[PDB]
Amino acid sequence: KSKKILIVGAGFSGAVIGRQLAEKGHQVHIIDQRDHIGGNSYDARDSETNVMVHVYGPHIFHTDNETVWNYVNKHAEMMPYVNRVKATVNGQVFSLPINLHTINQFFSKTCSPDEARALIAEKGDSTIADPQTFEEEALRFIGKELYEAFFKGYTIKQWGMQPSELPASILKRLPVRFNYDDNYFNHKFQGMPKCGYTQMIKSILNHENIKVDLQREFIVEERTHYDHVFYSGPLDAFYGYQYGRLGYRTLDFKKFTYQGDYQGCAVMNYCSVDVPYTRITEHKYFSPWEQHDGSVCYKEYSRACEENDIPYYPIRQMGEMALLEKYLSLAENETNITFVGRLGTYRYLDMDVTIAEALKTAEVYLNSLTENQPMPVFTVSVR
Ligand SMILES: Cc1cc2nc3c(=O)[nH]c(=O)nc-3n(C[C@H](O)[C@H](O)[C@H](O)COP(=O)(O)OP(=O)(O)OC[C@H]3O[C@@H](n4cnc5c(N)ncnc54)[C@H](O)[C@@H]3O)c2cc1C
Numbered sequence: 001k002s003k004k005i006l007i008v009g010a011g012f013s014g015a016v017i018g019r020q021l022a023e024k025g026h027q028v029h030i031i032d033q034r035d036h037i038g039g040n041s042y043d044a045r046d047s048e049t050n051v052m053v054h055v056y057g058p059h060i061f062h063t064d065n066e067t068v069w070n071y072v073n074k075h076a077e078m079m080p081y082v083n084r085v086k087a088t089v090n091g092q093v094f095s096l097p098i099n100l101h102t103i104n105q106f107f108s109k110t111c112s113p114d115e116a117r118a119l120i121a122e123k124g125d126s127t128i129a130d131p132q133t134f135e136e137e138a139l140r141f142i143g144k145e146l147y148e149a150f151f152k153g154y155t156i157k158q159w160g161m162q163p164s165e166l167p168a169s170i171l172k173r174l175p176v177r178f179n180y181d182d183n184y185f186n187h188k189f190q191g192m193p194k195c196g197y198t199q200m201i202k203s204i205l206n207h208e209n210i211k212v213d214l215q216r217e218f219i220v221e222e223r224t225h226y227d228h229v230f231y232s233g234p235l236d237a238f239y240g241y242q243y244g245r246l247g248y249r250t251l252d253f254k255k256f257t258y259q260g261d262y263q264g265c266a267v268m269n270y271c272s273v274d275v276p277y278t279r280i281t282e283h284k285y286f287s288p289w290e291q292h293d294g295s296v297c298y299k300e301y302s303r304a305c306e307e308n309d310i311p312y313y314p315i316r317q318m319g320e321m322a323l324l325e326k327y328l329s330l331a332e333n334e335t336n337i338t339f340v341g342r343l344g345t346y347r348y349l350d351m352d353v354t355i356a357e358a359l360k361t362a363e364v365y366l367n368s369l370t371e372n373q374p375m376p377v378f379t380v381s382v383r
Pocket residue numbers: 008009010011012013014031032033034037038039040041056057058059060061062216217218232233234251311312313340341342343349350351352354
């Protein structure tokens with residue numbers, strides 16, 4: 001049986017599920033309300049500067065999953081790229097994550113790894129036996145000066161919450177690296193597609209059994225034309241926000257163009273609340289194999305996600321997870337639909353994880369066909 005599949009969204013979730021089913025002879029119809037493919041991973045070349053701009057913010061590919069790595073290399077030339085982040089705070093510029101250079105610069109010292117371990121131990125606040133809060137966890141781990149420099153201002157700005165209002169769970173481990181490695185991510189596989197994520201997704205979408213329609217919102221009535229629907233849009237939006245909006249932090253990007261080199265790196269964090277933007281990204285630095293005279297940059301601002309704002313980071317506190325449960329109790333009673341992705345399942349997901357889940361979702365659907373089994377509404381736990 002060649003099934004008729006409707007996929008809502010042409011980001012990694014919809015494209016990867018689409019391709020897997022298309023290759024098994026299914027007739028896949030992919031719609032997206034936006035005027036372009038790629039979802040939040042979409043990139044485009046700026047006309048004036050020819051800079052490849054990460055349209056919805058910096059997207060760095062990283063993974064320990066060799067299957068996903070092999071998958072993306074089939075659809076893009078992946079360029080070696082190891083993301084390195086700088087942070088401006090206290091009138092100084094530091095490397096992030098906190099490492100031996102950070103500590104030595106911060107305290108004007110010359111510590112070895114072992115001396116730094118001892119400096120950190122004696123800086124840590126050993127007054128609260130069992131930290132319940134994120135502020136006290138941070139204080140226990142790294143002490144006041146480091147918590148206030150790198151953690152407090154950034155949490156307030158990024159989450160709109162005092163670290164005193166967050167659980168100790170947020171920080172399980174001492175957030176210090178006791179050497180001079182300054183790679184931001186620890187994953188085995190790290191890289192940037194040579195021609196960008198959009199070209200990568202276009203190659204994933206490049207199959208005769210995939211039809212793509214852009215500038216087209218999903219309409220609930222449509223469901224009946226298909227054997228199954230894969231929905232990578234917001235779970236709450238699917239239900240008309242009938243119980244209210246699931247809480248997100250939204251981002252605004254102020255775009256500007258500089259002649260030359262604005263900041264000399266891809267990402268600069270601004271950890272103080274005295275600075276209204278969280279970070280500035282200089283896109284050209286994501287493509288070191290290219291040279292550009294003009295430079296497109298983003299000042300990034302974080303705020304509470306309102307009406308018609310694009311959702312970015314899911315808050316997922318006790319109130320949001322409770323509201324979620326109301327949507328899930330509807331969702332789990334639906335037939336012939338699977339909710340997927342960052343929006344469909346209300347979770348922050350990396351590109352590699354998204355692709356991993358999409359490949360599994362398709363495998364689960366395909367299995368449900370062979371032995372005639374009922375497709376689950378979720379192929380991951382969402383609670
Ligand atoms: C600011 C930010 C930075 C990130 N940085 C990284 C990073 O550095 N590295 C990394 O690995 N990951 C990063 N991510 C995560 C990455 O963006 C996600 O993994 C990816 O977007 C997941 O893709 P998706 O297809 O599931 O969802 P999306 O990309 O959001 O796709 C959803 C698509 O569905 C469409 N859609 C929604 N509703 C409807 C509807 N009703 N009708 C028709 N179409 C609809 C939308 O237009 C959109 O194209 C970042 C995410 C954000 C938000």
